[PDB]
Amino acid sequence: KNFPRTVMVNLNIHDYYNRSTSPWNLHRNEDPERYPSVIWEAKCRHLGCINADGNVDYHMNSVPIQQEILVLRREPPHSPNSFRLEKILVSVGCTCVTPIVHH
Amino acid sequence: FPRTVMVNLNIHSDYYNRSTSPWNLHRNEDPERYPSVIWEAKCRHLGCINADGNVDYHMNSVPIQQEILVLRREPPHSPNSFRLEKILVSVGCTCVTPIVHH
Amino acid sequence: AIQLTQSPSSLSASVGDRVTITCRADESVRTLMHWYQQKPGKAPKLLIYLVSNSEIGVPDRFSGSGSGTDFRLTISSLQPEDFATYYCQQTWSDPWTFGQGTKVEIKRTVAAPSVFIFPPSDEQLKSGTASVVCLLNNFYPREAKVQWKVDNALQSGNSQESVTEQDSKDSTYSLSSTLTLSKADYEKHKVYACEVTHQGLSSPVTKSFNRGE
Amino acid sequence: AIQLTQSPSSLSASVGDRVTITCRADESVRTLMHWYQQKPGKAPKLLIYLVSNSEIGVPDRFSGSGSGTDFRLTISSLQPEDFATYYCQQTWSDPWTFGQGTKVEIKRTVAAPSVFIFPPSDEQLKSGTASVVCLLNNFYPREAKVQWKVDNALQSGNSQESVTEQDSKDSTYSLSSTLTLSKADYEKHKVYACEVTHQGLSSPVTKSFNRGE
Amino acid sequence: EVQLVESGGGLVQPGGSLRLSCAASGFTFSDYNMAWVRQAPGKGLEWVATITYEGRNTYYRDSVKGRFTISRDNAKNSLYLQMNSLRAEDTAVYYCASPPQYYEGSIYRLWFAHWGQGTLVTVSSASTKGPSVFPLAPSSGTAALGCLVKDYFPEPVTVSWNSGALTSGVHTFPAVLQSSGLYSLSSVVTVPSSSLGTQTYICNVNHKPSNTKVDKKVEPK
Amino acid sequence: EVQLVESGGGLVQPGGSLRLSCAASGFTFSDYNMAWVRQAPGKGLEWVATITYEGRNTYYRDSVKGRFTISRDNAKNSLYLQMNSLRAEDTAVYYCASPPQYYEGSIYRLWFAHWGQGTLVTVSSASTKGPSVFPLAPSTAALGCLVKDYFPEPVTVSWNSGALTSGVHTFPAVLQSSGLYSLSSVVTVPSSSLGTQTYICNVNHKPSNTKVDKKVEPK
Ligand SMILES: [Zn+2]
Ligand SMILES: [Zn+2]
Ligand SMILES: [Zn+2]
Ligand SMILES: [Zn+2]
Ligand SMILES: [Zn+2]
Ligand SMILES: [Zn+2]
């Protein structure tokens, strides 16, 4: 930290969201100042989970599964060949959790 | 074909247990990679946990896989030169219903 | 329509204590119960959503539990920065309602106040009023007694107190006592003093000045 | 112990057709039913796991459905590369069993074979045997008739046919017919011919050679 | 980061009108339902109104129905609260609150995952008065000094030291309502005694309702 | 990328023994249960044996119990199948298969997400014989190689060391009345490149250690 560490990087690389009990939708996130420019972020469809009869069960909850990912941010702005490594939080999908009803 | 750029590396929950499709995170360590440590999820069961706490085989736990960017040392053991690589990782598990219809 | 009752309305706990706040709804809200933390003079912040889920950035010491009509927020190990009012909220039915709040205060070791006295400025005296300020700096507990004495005569009904909210780091308070007199009354007497009585003081402390010195 | 029966055992469908293969278990396997695709001369590949989940890389046209004892694999729009044998497998109970397989063939437009004849090499003739090869290249359907004629005499019982598996791109077959004679029998005659009869030919095609020319 | 910034809060006579505004950033404003929540001085949180993502539906607290109007301009990423026929019950800090970004904005029953800073609305027939700032000069280890901000209306008054450069040891007291009906507060700071005649200490008082900005130098007499 | 590579398959006399081996890579081998699945010529898939992640438990198909032994060496990332008292029912291509990596290896009832290439085991008392390779010379032109009189299967044929793949047809072997196999491999090439381009078939019959590179020229 408190010292810039610059490295070289070669950029030339060599539908359950519908059937889930905690379903979700992917929303397009586009940023021209970022690599990857397009990131698909998941948003839970409901607060509850789908039960065996196809209805929303409010005794269980859909919660987003969030992961930290690396992205490249243009530095300076609009630079095609210089970036800063940035860590952002993204929603990958949703899982169904039971609320804590204990002690 | 090679597009080399500069990258400044100095950057400025209990769901796994409460989920009906629970999972465990396993440490993946690689000294020739950035990040060196990646936590990959593995589903705990084939079924989902029902309201009574047991495994329900009428529903399935399936991994939620995302493509992520990683930096791979090029040449090997290089501290300042990498190649951008896209790998698939398991982030967690969700519970799905099998299709029982046409 | 859905009424939420929090218990207790206030509590005091030492650093490291396990604190528990309950929220009871008059009808079931299933899992649509959330908790918020509001620090003095700040907007509320979301702590827990849907009974037990902490938002990213909320420390592990905060956990929520419950179902239907009975809910609980637990702070496993209280920290000095946890000084705040906690509110529960139901979103199950319209209108969305909140609990009355639970104020959480920190119990701490005794600290004696640092007493300072300030005479009125000559600029204020030019306007016809004199304000004499006594400052009690960074003490614990909040209970303190300030008595104003004008030439050894004990004053009453001519002063106002103001107390800061508990510090989020050392859990101490600060108090200002202000004696307000007319310029004419101020010029009549010489010795202005404030006598402070506090748990942390072996004997009361008097800070005083002579008018024009 | 758990027996799986696939239906049908083989089928032929045009490109673009919706194909359906069923798998019936004699006892319930709940959701522990999986499908595999095996292309000729290759190891099986996992297509679907746990009734309906496609593995990453499997095209959208493949989907699985089912419950307990009745399961179905559907290919929504058959492609030429889908030529393969599909197997269902249950992992619910020991021992893990597979269905007998379903061979999927592609129905295509008629394509006439290109016929080629090859005389035996002088190197082979030095060893005492003569093998005459007739090649029928890139044709459809698979049904073709090859007749060997030596000095116009129709041969029988001295030739063997070999057919390639259906091409994964153009859905055609190729066939080799090999006439095997002793060197002594080979040297007794002049004209060696193979007469090909196929749906795509207006009249049978004869390719021939004169021994030692 | 999601940011909600409110403006419009001030002194308003009973029966009068005031318009609150909330500028949103850091999220797709047009994808989410927005709400106004209020807090009366020394009281709890109270939901006031909700408006759907494209302003087609509005919901209000019974006590404000017919008097308040919630609106939004998705093109300007802003939320509004038009308040009419103002009463004593309406004196409160008003917050604009947004739902969580990782849930579909079509879910009505979402909580408030993001709140603005709050804007104070004071319903009173009393008149605006700017403050008088006087020094609280130190006397002859650790010395204490400050500023007395006297006779102002309405709340609030903001006090900073050395333009925000001095934050350690600062104590800005809650205002007290004097028997005169005007507010008064003191802001103090403890500094080392060695830096008394060396360092300059200035309190910056700002009372936006009267457009009063005073920078008072506090020196030992 | 997960990779499973088998070896050891060959001709073995009835009543004899053979050991099959599977080299694994691309995953934590010691985390997963491994299995052997076989396929008799022209028949379906048949599970043979399973061994747990740390070799503590083994399971077998009834017909192979007592004759086969599944083992593993987690340090060498390899799986083994020791086959004894071999019968006709054991002639098959043997595959080693591994479970999916995104599930806990403690789940016994997992499917086969990855498979090796397969190794052929032939149980026969017939003797090994290497093939003779003869040209099928052209007169679009067609040319090829006749790979005659070999035992057992298989034979691999490539053209110009794998550089020529378009238009190649390697036919399934036919069992001649002699008890030996024979096959032809052909390729269609442009007639313009007949006396210009050199065409060589590379035949490999590993059971007899026969490697022949035959140049096919017009006579
Ligand atoms: Zn829905
Ligand atoms: Zn329920
Ligand atoms: Zn479990
Ligand atoms: Zn069930
Ligand atoms: Zn006196
Ligand atoms: Zn071990």
mmCIF file of all heavy atoms in Angstrom, chain C residues 116-143:
data_model
loop_
_atom_site.group_PDB
_atom_site.id
_atom_site.type_symbol
_atom_site.label_atom_id
_atom_site.label_comp_id
_atom_site.label_asym_id
_atom_site.label_seq_id
_atom_site.Cartn_x
_atom_site.Cartn_y
_atom_site.Cartn_z
ATOM 1 N N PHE C 116 -13.963 23.890 33.176
ATOM 2 C CA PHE C 116 -13.465 25.154 32.647
ATOM 3 C C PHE C 116 -14.520 26.232 32.794
ATOM 4 O O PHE C 116 -15.699 25.959 32.595
ATOM 5 C CB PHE C 116 -13.098 25.031 31.168
ATOM 6 C CG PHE C 116 -12.118 23.934 30.858
ATOM 7 C CD1 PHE C 116 -12.557 22.684 30.461
ATOM 8 C CD2 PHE C 116 -10.758 24.165 30.906
ATOM 9 C CE1 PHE C 116 -11.657 21.681 30.155
ATOM 10 C CE2 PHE C 116 -9.859 23.162 30.594
ATOM 11 C CZ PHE C 116 -10.314 21.928 30.213
ATOM 12 N N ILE C 117 -14.109 27.459 33.130
ATOM 13 C CA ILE C 117 -15.055 28.573 33.226
ATOM 14 C C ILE C 117 -14.709 29.649 32.196
ATOM 15 O O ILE C 117 -13.536 29.831 31.859
ATOM 16 C CB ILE C 117 -15.232 29.132 34.659
ATOM 17 C CG1 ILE C 117 -16.486 30.035 34.749
ATOM 18 C CG2 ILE C 117 -13.972 29.848 35.142
ATOM 19 C CD1 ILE C 117 -16.829 30.518 36.149
ATOM 20 N N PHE C 118 -15.727 30.297 31.631
ATOM 21 C CA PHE C 118 -15.509 31.319 30.625
ATOM 22 C C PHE C 118 -16.293 32.540 30.985
ATOM 23 O O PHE C 118 -17.521 32.479 31.098
ATOM 24 C CB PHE C 118 -15.960 30.855 29.237
ATOM 25 C CG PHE C 118 -15.270 29.617 28.751
ATOM 26 C CD1 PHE C 118 -15.875 28.379 28.868
ATOM 27 C CD2 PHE C 118 -14.029 29.689 28.153
ATOM 28 C CE1 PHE C 118 -15.246 27.235 28.408
ATOM 29 C CE2 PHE C 118 -13.413 28.545 27.670
ATOM 30 C CZ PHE C 118 -14.017 27.323 27.818
ATOM 31 N N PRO C 119 -15.614 33.680 31.132
ATOM 32 C CA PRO C 119 -16.356 34.917 31.385
ATOM 33 C C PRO C 119 -17.045 35.394 30.095
ATOM 34 O O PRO C 119 -16.657 35.019 28.978
ATOM 35 C CB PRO C 119 -15.264 35.885 31.839
ATOM 36 C CG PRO C 119 -14.043 35.424 31.149
ATOM 37 C CD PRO C 119 -14.161 33.922 30.995
ATOM 38 N N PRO C 120 -18.079 36.230 30.233
ATOM 39 C CA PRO C 120 -18.727 36.778 29.033
ATOM 40 C C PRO C 120 -17.775 37.704 28.284
ATOM 41 O O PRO C 120 -16.953 38.387 28.897
ATOM 42 C CB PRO C 120 -19.917 37.556 29.594
ATOM 43 C CG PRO C 120 -19.523 37.895 30.980
ATOM 44 C CD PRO C 120 -18.667 36.772 31.473
ATOM 45 N N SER C 121 -17.865 37.705 26.961
ATOM 46 C CA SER C 121 -17.019 38.558 26.139
ATOM 47 C C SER C 121 -17.432 40.023 26.297
ATOM 48 O O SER C 121 -18.598 40.308 26.595
ATOM 49 C CB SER C 121 -17.146 38.158 24.676
ATOM 50 O OG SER C 121 -18.502 38.213 24.269
ATOM 51 N N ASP C 122 -16.489 40.955 26.092
ATOM 52 C CA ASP C 122 -16.824 42.379 26.152
ATOM 53 C C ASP C 122 -17.809 42.752 25.024
ATOM 54 O O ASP C 122 -18.663 43.612 25.219
ATOM 55 C CB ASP C 122 -15.559 43.256 26.112
ATOM 56 C CG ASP C 122 -14.743 43.234 27.400
ATOM 57 O OD1 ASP C 122 -14.681 42.162 28.048
ATOM 58 O OD2 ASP C 122 -14.163 44.290 27.760
ATOM 59 N N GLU C 123 -17.733 42.046 23.882
ATOM 60 C CA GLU C 123 -18.613 42.227 22.735
ATOM 61 C C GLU C 123 -20.060 41.902 23.113
ATOM 62 O O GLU C 123 -20.969 42.630 22.717
ATOM 63 C CB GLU C 123 -18.152 41.335 21.569
ATOM 64 C CG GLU C 123 -16.660 41.434 21.286
ATOM 65 C CD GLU C 123 -16.006 40.137 20.860
ATOM 66 O OE1 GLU C 123 -16.625 39.391 20.066
ATOM 67 O OE2 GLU C 123 -14.871 39.870 21.321
ATOM 68 N N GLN C 124 -20.275 40.834 23.900
ATOM 69 C CA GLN C 124 -21.626 40.488 24.342
ATOM 70 C C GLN C 124 -22.134 41.499 25.353
ATOM 71 O O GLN C 124 -23.297 41.898 25.300
ATOM 72 C CB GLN C 124 -21.694 39.080 24.953
ATOM 73 C CG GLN C 124 -23.126 38.688 25.285
ATOM 74 C CD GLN C 124 -23.232 37.498 26.177
ATOM 75 O OE1 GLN C 124 -22.287 37.124 26.882
ATOM 76 N NE2 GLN C 124 -24.410 36.896 26.188
ATOM 77 N N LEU C 125 -21.269 41.916 26.277
ATOM 78 C CA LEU C 125 -21.631 42.897 27.290
ATOM 79 C C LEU C 125 -22.113 44.215 26.694
ATOM 80 O O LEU C 125 -22.986 44.859 27.266
ATOM 81 C CB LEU C 125 -20.469 43.103 28.250
ATOM 82 C CG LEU C 125 -20.231 41.906 29.149
ATOM 83 C CD1 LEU C 125 -18.909 42.012 29.865
ATOM 84 C CD2 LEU C 125 -21.351 41.752 30.138
ATOM 85 N N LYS C 126 -21.606 44.569 25.507
ATOM 86 C CA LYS C 126 -22.032 45.751 24.774
ATOM 87 C C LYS C 126 -23.502 45.671 24.324
ATOM 88 O O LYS C 126 -24.136 46.705 24.119
ATOM 89 C CB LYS C 126 -21.088 45.996 23.593
ATOM 90 C CG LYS C 126 -19.785 46.627 24.081
ATOM 91 C CD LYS C 126 -18.654 46.611 23.065
ATOM 92 C CE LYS C 126 -17.372 47.051 23.740
ATOM 93 N NZ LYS C 126 -16.394 47.633 22.782
ATOM 94 N N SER C 127 -24.054 44.459 24.218
ATOM 95 C CA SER C 127 -25.448 44.239 23.839
ATOM 96 C C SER C 127 -26.435 44.205 25.038
ATOM 97 O O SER C 127 -27.647 44.155 24.826
ATOM 98 C CB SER C 127 -25.588 42.984 22.978
ATOM 99 O OG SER C 127 -25.242 41.811 23.696
ATOM 100 N N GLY C 128 -25.923 44.226 26.266
ATOM 101 C CA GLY C 128 -26.778 44.264 27.448
ATOM 102 C C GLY C 128 -27.028 42.973 28.204
ATOM 103 O O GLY C 128 -27.816 42.959 29.155
ATOM 104 N N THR C 129 -26.366 41.886 27.813
ATOM 105 C CA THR C 129 -26.528 40.606 28.499
ATOM 106 C C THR C 129 -25.173 39.975 28.789
ATOM 107 O O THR C 129 -24.218 40.208 28.056
ATOM 108 C CB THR C 129 -27.421 39.683 27.669
ATOM 109 O OG1 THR C 129 -28.655 40.351 27.423
ATOM 110 C CG2 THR C 129 -27.694 38.361 28.355
ATOM 111 N N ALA C 130 -25.079 39.189 29.858
ATOM 112 C CA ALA C 130 -23.856 38.494 30.199
ATOM 113 C C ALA C 130 -24.137 37.006 30.307
ATOM 114 O O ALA C 130 -25.047 36.594 31.026
ATOM 115 C CB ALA C 130 -23.307 39.013 31.510
ATOM 116 N N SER C 131 -23.364 36.199 29.588
ATOM 117 C CA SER C 131 -23.518 34.755 29.629
ATOM 118 C C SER C 131 -22.223 34.178 30.148
ATOM 119 O O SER C 131 -21.169 34.365 29.542
ATOM 120 C CB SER C 131 -23.822 34.187 28.243
ATOM 121 O OG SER C 131 -25.114 34.529 27.766
ATOM 122 N N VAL C 132 -22.299 33.486 31.275
ATOM 123 C CA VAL C 132 -21.129 32.874 31.878
ATOM 124 C C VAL C 132 -21.233 31.375 31.624
ATOM 125 O O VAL C 132 -22.249 30.779 31.964
ATOM 126 C CB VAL C 132 -21.043 33.183 33.388
ATOM 127 C CG1 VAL C 132 -19.689 32.766 33.927
ATOM 128 C CG2 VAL C 132 -21.293 34.662 33.671
ATOM 129 N N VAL C 133 -20.215 30.766 30.996
ATOM 130 C CA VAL C 133 -20.272 29.344 30.662
ATOM 131 C C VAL C 133 -19.329 28.466 31.482
ATOM 132 O O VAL C 133 -18.159 28.783 31.633
ATOM 133 C CB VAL C 133 -20.041 29.143 29.156
ATOM 134 C CG1 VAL C 133 -20.125 27.670 28.786
ATOM 135 C CG2 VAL C 133 -21.032 29.961 28.335
ATOM 136 N N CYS C 134 -19.849 27.357 32.006
ATOM 137 C CA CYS C 134 -19.083 26.365 32.753
ATOM 138 C C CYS C 134 -19.097 25.093 31.895
ATOM 139 O O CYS C 134 -20.153 24.668 31.442
ATOM 140 C CB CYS C 134 -19.712 26.127 34.123
ATOM 141 S SG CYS C 134 -18.645 25.256 35.308
ATOM 142 N N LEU C 135 -17.929 24.531 31.609
ATOM 143 C CA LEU C 135 -17.806 23.344 30.776
ATOM 144 C C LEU C 135 -17.297 22.170 31.602
ATOM 145 O O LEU C 135 -16.294 22.291 32.292
ATOM 146 C CB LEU C 135 -16.833 23.629 29.612
ATOM 147 C CG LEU C 135 -16.328 22.445 28.795
ATOM 148 C CD1 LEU C 135 -17.449 21.800 28.008
ATOM 149 C CD2 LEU C 135 -15.211 22.860 27.881
ATOM 150 N N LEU C 136 -17.965 21.025 31.497
ATOM 151 C CA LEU C 136 -17.568 19.792 32.156
ATOM 152 C C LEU C 136 -17.152 18.914 31.022
ATOM 153 O O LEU C 136 -17.997 18.524 30.222
ATOM 154 C CB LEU C 136 -18.759 19.168 32.842
ATOM 155 C CG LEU C 136 -19.011 19.629 34.241
ATOM 156 C CD1 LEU C 136 -19.790 20.927 34.233
ATOM 157 C CD2 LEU C 136 -19.738 18.550 35.029
ATOM 158 N N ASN C 137 -15.861 18.659 30.898
ATOM 159 C CA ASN C 137 -15.337 17.956 29.743
ATOM 160 C C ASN C 137 -15.012 16.482 29.948
ATOM 161 O O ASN C 137 -14.240 16.107 30.836
ATOM 162 C CB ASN C 137 -14.115 18.689 29.204
ATOM 163 C CG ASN C 137 -13.780 18.357 27.776
ATOM 164 O OD1 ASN C 137 -14.627 18.402 26.876
ATOM 165 N ND2 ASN C 137 -12.526 18.013 27.540
ATOM 166 N N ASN C 138 -15.591 15.665 29.054
ATOM 167 C CA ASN C 138 -15.411 14.236 28.879
ATOM 168 C C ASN C 138 -15.432 13.428 30.197
ATOM 169 O O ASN C 138 -14.431 12.827 30.573
ATOM 170 C CB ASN C 138 -14.154 13.967 28.033
ATOM 171 C CG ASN C 138 -14.280 14.441 26.578
ATOM 172 O OD1 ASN C 138 -15.194 14.031 25.815
ATOM 173 N ND2 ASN C 138 -13.352 15.300 26.146
ATOM 174 N N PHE C 139 -16.614 13.350 30.840
ATOM 175 C CA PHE C 139 -16.841 12.614 32.087
ATOM 176 C C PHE C 139 -17.792 11.384 31.940
ATOM 177 O O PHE C 139 -18.408 11.189 30.898
ATOM 178 C CB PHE C 139 -17.380 13.582 33.152
ATOM 179 C CG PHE C 139 -18.673 14.284 32.798
ATOM 180 C CD1 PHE C 139 -19.878 13.863 33.330
ATOM 181 C CD2 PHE C 139 -18.674 15.405 31.987
ATOM 182 C CE1 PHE C 139 -21.065 14.514 33.013
ATOM 183 C CE2 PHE C 139 -19.866 16.039 31.654
ATOM 184 C CZ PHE C 139 -21.050 15.597 32.176
ATOM 185 N N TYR C 140 -17.888 10.547 32.976
ATOM 186 C CA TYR C 140 -18.805 9.404 33.023
ATOM 187 C C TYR C 140 -19.027 9.057 34.498
ATOM 188 O O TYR C 140 -18.033 8.974 35.220
ATOM 189 C CB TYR C 140 -18.279 8.170 32.256
ATOM 190 C CG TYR C 140 -19.333 7.082 32.197
ATOM 191 C CD1 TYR C 140 -20.297 7.075 31.194
ATOM 192 C CD2 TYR C 140 -19.467 6.161 33.228
ATOM 193 C CE1 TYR C 140 -21.344 6.164 31.207
ATOM 194 C CE2 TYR C 140 -20.527 5.269 33.264
ATOM 195 C CZ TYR C 140 -21.450 5.260 32.243
ATOM 196 O OH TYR C 140 -22.479 4.362 32.297
ATOM 197 N N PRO C 141 -20.273 8.835 34.995
ATOM 198 C CA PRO C 141 -21.567 8.841 34.291
ATOM 199 C C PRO C 141 -22.102 10.223 33.944
ATOM 200 O O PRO C 141 -21.472 11.221 34.277
ATOM 201 C CB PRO C 141 -22.474 8.076 35.265
ATOM 202 C CG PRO C 141 -21.946 8.439 36.600
ATOM 203 C CD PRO C 141 -20.452 8.492 36.421
ATOM 204 N N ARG C 142 -23.265 10.281 33.278
ATOM 205 C CA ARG C 142 -23.889 11.534 32.865
ATOM 206 C C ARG C 142 -24.375 12.383 34.048
ATOM 207 O O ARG C 142 -24.429 13.613 33.936
ATOM 208 C CB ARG C 142 -25.045 11.240 31.909
ATOM 209 C CG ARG C 142 -25.661 12.468 31.263
ATOM 210 C CD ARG C 142 -26.875 12.067 30.463
ATOM 211 N NE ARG C 142 -27.786 13.191 30.259
ATOM 212 C CZ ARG C 142 -28.228 13.592 29.071
ATOM 213 N NH1 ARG C 142 -27.845 12.961 27.961
ATOM 214 N NH2 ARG C 142 -29.057 14.625 28.979
ATOM 215 N N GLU C 143 -24.710 11.740 35.184
ATOM 216 C CA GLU C 143 -25.182 12.484 36.350
ATOM 217 C C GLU C 143 -24.105 13.372 36.981
ATOM 218 O O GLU C 143 -23.100 12.886 37.494
ATOM 219 C CB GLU C 143 -25.820 11.562 37.396
ATOM 220 C CG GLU C 143 -26.443 12.333 38.555
ATOM 221 C CD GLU C 143 -26.244 11.743 39.946
ATOM 222 O OE1 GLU C 143 -26.208 10.494 40.069
ATOM 223 O OE2 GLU C 143 -26.126 12.535 40.915
#
